[PDB]
Design a protein around this ligand. Structure first.
Ligand SMILES: CCCCC/C=C\C/C=C\CCCCCCCC(=O)O
Ligand SMILES: CCCCC/C=C\C/C=C\CCCCCCCC(=O)O
Ligand SMILES: CCCCCCCCCCCCCCCC
Ligand SMILES: CCCCCCCCCCCCCCCC
Ligand SMILES: CCCCCCCCCCCC
Ligand SMILES: CCCCCCCCCCCC
Ligand SMILES: CCCCCCCCCCCC
Ligand SMILES: CCCCCCCCCCCC
Ligand SMILES: CCCCCCCCCCCC
Ligand SMILES: CCCCCCCCCCCC
Ligand SMILES: CCCCCCCC
Ligand SMILES: CCCCCCCC
Ligand SMILES: CCCCCCCC
Ligand SMILES: CCCCCCCC
Ligand SMILES: CCCCCCCC
Ligand SMILES: CCCCCCCC
Ligand SMILES: CCCCCCCC
Ligand SMILES: CCCCCCCC
Ligand SMILES: CCCCCC
Ligand SMILES: CCCCCC
Ligand SMILES: CCCCCC
Ligand SMILES: CCCCCC
Ligand SMILES: CCCCCC
Ligand SMILES: CCCCCC
Ligand SMILES: CCCCCC
Ligand SMILES: CCCCCC
Ligand SMILES: CCCCCC
Ligand SMILES: CCCCCC
Ligand SMILES: CCCCCC
Ligand SMILES: CCCCCC
Ligand SMILES: CCCCCC
Ligand SMILES: CCCCCC
Ligand SMILES: [K+]
Ligand SMILES: [K+]
Ligand SMILES: [K+]
Ligand SMILES: [K+]
Lengths: 262, 262
């Protein structure tokens, strides 16, 4: 009866969390959304009046442009999709569950293979992340044991969950700052935008509003792609481990809550 | 030295998998991409000639349209973002790490809160999925014990990983087929497109090319949203559990191959 109680309590807490978050986000974003819509409508009306076109013709043109954009066309010299490098980027975003969406299959055959590829590939990445976490814990224990032994001259050393969480948080912060230091100059982004993109990509949410390495010519462009790959990989690993540790802590907190209640 | 060997072997296998997948996807998609780009270019050239519009004017108009679309505008009628139910949909896609991207924060304050909200919410959903998996295993064991006891008239009953994987696969197939039973007449999609969307959403990849339940008016629109919520929740749970079980099986296969290599 304890497991059922914990399950029910977690469900109720998550529901309340969702309701509160929805309220807050609406309060923050509604006015900006309305203002943007009004500005776009004014621009469209002015353009239509200037060149004495028709609303239907512009509607058809915009529909064609939306189809082209789904195809992969953009307005600023984007890199080609579905070349070998683009395909590599797409598969990397698929196996990790990020799914930016800047490149998606468009033909029958490219969707079946996507299903099978993801089905056989996502578990492998999850297993890789788990193995990395285990290796990190072992190395931390070894370092602590060695440091204590060396300082004495003046296995059972597994660190607690709290220290592992602190270490993962520090590593994530450092990786995000280092990645942003490179994204900001190469891209036309601000530092805060770089941090926001780093968090969105590392957590595997992948909205797709900001995507890196999509500007065709990128000066060097040889080391830049390798650096982007390395940074995304490390960030994903660190954030995945941090989320799992935080989940363990939340589970302990829920038991404590249940135990206190009586 | 065994753990390091398994780690290295998994890394090499994943790298080969990525290379092969990239090659296959490029081979499948490059011709379609080129044809679509050519068709869009022809359409744009034809439109420009007919109305005597300069290409810079059309470029500016399309840039404005891309800015507007980034705020939620579409050629077809779509439900508003950030009123109260768009916010609920957004938070649901955020906590589950799906990230469709049809709704994204656009203001400072809506991005900081997004970071903190995700940081505190994703671990809760992961814990909920793990608890669900444990409950499912317990119920399966109880059912098997009861069935065996009944068949006798003529704890240690937990099923093996193989049977749990088979059950999860069957449940996922049934849920996907039932969900696609709708989403075909309500969304005007083909059945295969419905299955593709179900897999993309359930796995938490969330490309965003196909998003459900946003067409402004949706007939009832009261039960439809509830049904969409329930279907997505169940699919996400089942696919998450299936991925974890498959990862365990892959780990066993790796240990066996390592033992085979001596
Ligand atoms: C060497 C370690 C092997 C393990 C690989 C495991 C998982 C891969 C997961 C995610 C990769 C992040 C996306 C890379 C994007 C390529 C960028 C570019 O090309 O511009
Ligand atoms: C009662 C169980 C509580 C636990 C819920 C936990 C996590 C929620 C995760 C995913 C739900 C995503 C569905 C998207 C919302 C659709 C709403 C709509 O179409 O408008
Ligand atoms: C969305 C889930 C919210 C998580 C609720 C956190 C509960 C806080 C309890 C903190 C005390 C538990 C730690 C042990 C105290 C000795
Ligand atoms: C993306 C990497 C996938 C690697 C899958 C490895 C498959 C190995 C098959 C081995 C089958 C025998 C194992 C079961 C015997 C105990
Ligand atoms: C144009 C060069 C792109 C480089 C990205 C591919 C190489 C990384 C995969 C191999 C890592 C061991
Ligand atoms: C204009 C030169 C930009 C090149 C950026 C170099 C990126 C490599 C950093 C180190 C890789 C880990
Ligand atoms: C003996 C130790 C060397 C092999 C372990 C390294 C495998 C990962 C290297 C790349 C970082 C993900
Ligand atoms: C217990 C489930 C709580 C969430 C219900 C909200 C979704 C229904 C939307 C109805 C809007 C007309
Ligand atoms: C006319 C459109 C009616 C569609 C309503 C959907 C009914 C689904 C309810 C069951 C939820 C699991
Ligand atoms: C005894 C009842 C406790 C469990 C009820 C929780 C119902 C939530 C269903 C969510 C399944 C994905
Ligand atoms: C038309 C190519 C078919 C690709 C699907 C392969 C599934 C194993
Ligand atoms: C025993 C060596 C473990 C490898 C750790 C690598 C972390 C970047
Ligand atoms: C840590 C990488 C620093 C890159 C600086 C780029 C300056 C043009
Ligand atoms: C000019 C391309 C350099 C690629 C670096 C790869 C390092 C293993
Ligand atoms: C303008 C109000 C922003 C509040 C940010 C939320 C901090 C947790
Ligand atoms: C005793 C188990 C009850 C909860 C399981 C519900 C599965 C849908
Ligand atoms: C389980 C859903 C049944 C099909 C609903 C759509 C009927 C037009
Ligand atoms: C008319 C609104 C119906 C809402 C579904 C019931 C929620 C339990
Ligand atoms: C946490 C309380 C929810 C508020 C609903 C508007
Ligand atoms: C957490 C309650 C939301 C307050 C903003 C209206
Ligand atoms: C967390 C409270 C934010 C209030 C939005 C105006
Ligand atoms: C551009 C081809 C890259 C080769 C990968 C080793
Ligand atoms: C068009 C055939 C679809 C096959 C289902 C996997
Ligand atoms: C005690 C500090 C060790 C950190 C391991 C990365
Ligand atoms: C089996 C690896 C060969 C590389 C093919 C491009
Ligand atoms: C061995 C995987 C396939 C290699 C093709 C680039
Ligand atoms: C599975 C390897 C693909 C080679 C054809 C491009
Ligand atoms: C592994 C090689 C397959 C070739 C596909 C065209
Ligand atoms: C393995 C699939 C081959 C693709 C042929 C175009
Ligand atoms: C407008 C919908 C209200 C939801 C409260 C449960
Ligand atoms: C979380 C960093 C704050 C950014 C201020 C613009
Ligand atoms: C035969 C066992 C059935 C379990 C499915 C919930
Ligand atoms: K994800
Ligand atoms: K996504
Ligand atoms: K995702
Ligand atoms: K996305």
């Amino acid at each position: 009866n304890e497991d059922n109680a914990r399950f029910l309590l977690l469900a109720a807490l998550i529901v309340l969390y969702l309701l509160g978050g929805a309220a807050v986000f609406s309060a923050l974003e509604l006015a900006h959304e309305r203002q943007a819509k009004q500005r776009w409508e004014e621009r469209l009306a002015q353009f239509s009046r200037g060149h004495q076109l028709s609303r239907d013709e512009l509607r058809g043109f915009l529909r064609h442009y939306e189809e082209a954009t789904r195809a992969g066309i953009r307005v600023d010299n984007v890199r080609p999709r579905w070349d070998f490098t683009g395909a590599f980027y797409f598969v990397g975003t698929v196996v990790s569950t990020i799914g930016f969406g800047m490149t998606t299959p468009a033909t029958v055959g490219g969707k079946i293979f996507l299903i099978f590829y993801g089905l056989v590939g996502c578990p492998s990445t999850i297993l890789f992340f788990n193995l990395f976490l285990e290796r990190l814990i072992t190395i931390i224990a070894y370092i602590m044991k060695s440091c204590h032994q060396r300082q004495l001259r003046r296995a059972g050393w597994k660190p607690s969950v709290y220290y592992v969480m602190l270490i993962l948080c520090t590593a994530s912060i450092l990786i995000s700052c280092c990645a942003s230091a490179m994204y900001t100059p190469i891209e036309g982004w601000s530092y805060f935008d770089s941090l926001y993109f780093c968090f969105v990509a590392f957590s595997t949410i992948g909205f797709g509003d900001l995507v890196s390495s999509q500007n065709a010519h990128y000066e060097s462009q040889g080391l830049y792609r390798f650096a982007n790959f390395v940074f995304i990989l490390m960030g994903v690993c660190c954030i995945y481990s941090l989320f799992n540790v935080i989940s363990i802590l939340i589970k302990q907190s829920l038991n404590w809550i249940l135990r206190k209640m009586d």
